[PDB]
Design a protein around this ligand. Structure first.
Ligand SMILES: [Mn+2]
Ligand SMILES: [Mn+2]
Ligand code: NA
Length: 237
């Protein structure tokens, strides 16, 4: 199976599998059952922003999710990614809907990773910024129901011609180039990702969520990972 590290913006409380009884953000280390969560006052229909950071000095994965003029939600977890992920990975965004649904629209996505050599102290870096997603965005690997082009946005999950979200959908978008997330011979390493999203739902409750994730380069959507699995895991273990 794939190896996954992710920050989930979980819009639906699946308490049967460990979710807290409220929308929340969480840090997922090789399991959909978050190692740490924070309550999230998600706002149906408003554009929000997510900020994720990590560095090899503190080895603490943190995320901040908020909406303009509202109190933000923050979650942090100490984890040595060297012991979790392979040296080379791909980064991406994933989202899903299930019995309940929502739009999982990405309006922007940026990422920066840096690795400073212990032998020369010089740095290798990668940075990309997407403010517009075109119909044929070749530097992105779209999987499942993910599409680009409509209004210049990235729709991770299925949406009808009118804009209404569809249920039991799952989709992901990964940056084309592999990323060197960690290296034993690196004195200092870090990464940060930010994305703006618009989650809107006509249902009694929205579901299921969006996530920023890091995985083995050849990662693919696990069969059946719609709904509460967020297109990241094969099961809820
Ligand atoms: Mn959930
Ligand atoms: Mn959750
Ligand atoms: Na945009």
């Amino acid at each position: 199976a794939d190896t996954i590290v992710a920050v989930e913006l979980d819009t639906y409380p699946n308490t049967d599998i460990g979710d807290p009884s409220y929308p929340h953000i969480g840090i997922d280390i090789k399991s959909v059952r978050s190692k740490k969560t924070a309550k999230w006052n998600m706002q149906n229909g408003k554009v929000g922003t997510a900020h994720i950071i990590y560095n090899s000095v503190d080895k603490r994965l943190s995320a901040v999710v908020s909406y303009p003029n509202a109190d933000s939600a923050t979650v942090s977890y100490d984890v040595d990614l060297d012991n979790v992920l392979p040296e080379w990975v791909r980064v991406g965004l994933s989202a899903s809907t299930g019995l309940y649904k929502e739009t999982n629209t990405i309006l922007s996505w940026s990422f920066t990773s840096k690795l400073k050599s212990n032998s020369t102290h010089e740095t290798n870096a990668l940075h990309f910024m997407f403010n517009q997603f075109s119909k044929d965005q070749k530097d992105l690997i779209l999987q499942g129901d993910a599409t680009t082009g409509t209004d210049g946005n990235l729709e991770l999950t299925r949406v009808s011609s009118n804009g209404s979200p569809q249920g039991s959908s799952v989709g992901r978008a990964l940056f084309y180039a592999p990323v060197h997330i960690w290296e034993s011979s690196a004195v200092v390493a870090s990464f940060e990702a930010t994305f703006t999203f618009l989650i809107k739902s006509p249902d009694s409750h929205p579901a299921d969520g969006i996530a920023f994730f890091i995985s083995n380069i050849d990662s693919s959507i696990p069969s059946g990972s719609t709904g509460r699995l967020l297109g990241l895991f094969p099961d809820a273990n």
